[PDB]
Design a protein around this ligand. Structure first.
Ligand SMILES: N=C(N)c1ccc(Br)cc1
Ligand SMILES: [Ca+2]
Length: 223
């Protein structure tokens, strides 16, 4: 997260870290046994880390649970990043509390102008690299479809939306991949891609979760 603020320990209780010996992606807890992330975060041997603030220090509220199964969306296209969403089933159910909690799926799609919360442990600089150890937060609005398509001609599908600031300076970044975009208490987006980070006229692009609720519910019910 570039240009954000320190969230505060366990103030984003649905945020997960995906760990394969090191943090490599974010995710969102959607019930006690399932996590949603980006398909471009796929790999084998994932450990899901819940209840994290400082990802380099054991602070006492963590739960570490291995993944038993990962399911990439059947239509994910790694060249265009269309359908950039994946589900991860935990080997055992998390213990839910005030600091580890699930986030609700949306019943409708959020409109442009809605303010949302984006969070992650990704790069905090738009040039160079500096990775924080504690969770960062950013409040940002959803942008109109026309501004999004004007920023990225020929690249925005119906399964993507833009959020952020056309002036630059505030954005998600590498390492935030797969993490949540939460608006009005519902999961509306997944950190997916962008051109650089926090560049002028290049806002972040997010997977449009409301298009996938039926696939998520059917998949969870059968696996
Ligand atoms: N929002 C961005 N600018 C961005 C997000 C994820 C990745 Br990976 C790269 C860039
Ligand atoms: Ca920790």
């Amino acid at each position: 997260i570039v240009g954000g603020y320190t969230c505060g320990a366990n103030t984003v209780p649905y945020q997960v870290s995906l760990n394969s010996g090191y943090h490599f992606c974010g995710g969102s807890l959607i019930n006690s046994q399932w996590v949603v992330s980006a398909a471009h975060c796929y790999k084998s041997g994932i450990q899901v880390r819940l209840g994290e603030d400082n990802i380099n220090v054991v602070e006492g509220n963590e739960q570490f649970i291995s993944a038993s199964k990962s399911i990439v969306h059947p239509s994910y296209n790694s060249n265009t990043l269309n359908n950039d969403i994946m589900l991860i089933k935990l080997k055992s159910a998390a213990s839910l509390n005030s600091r580890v909690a699930s986030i609700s799926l949306p019943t409708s799609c959020a409109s442009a102008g809605t303010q949302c919360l984006i969070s992650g442990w990704g790069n905090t600089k738009s040039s160079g690299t500096s990775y924080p150890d504690v969770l960062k937060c950013l409040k940002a609005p959803i942008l109109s479809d026309s501004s999004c398509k004007s920023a990225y001609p020929g690249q925005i599908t119906s399964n993507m939306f833009c959020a952020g600031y056309l002036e630059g300076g505030k954005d998600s970044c590498q390492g935030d991949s797969g993490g949540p975009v939460v608006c009005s208490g519902k999961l509306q987006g997944i950190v997916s891609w962008g051109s650089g980070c926090a560049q002028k006229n290049k806002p972040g692009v997010y997977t449009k979760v409301c298009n996938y609720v039926s696939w998520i519910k059917q998949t969870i019910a059968s696996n």
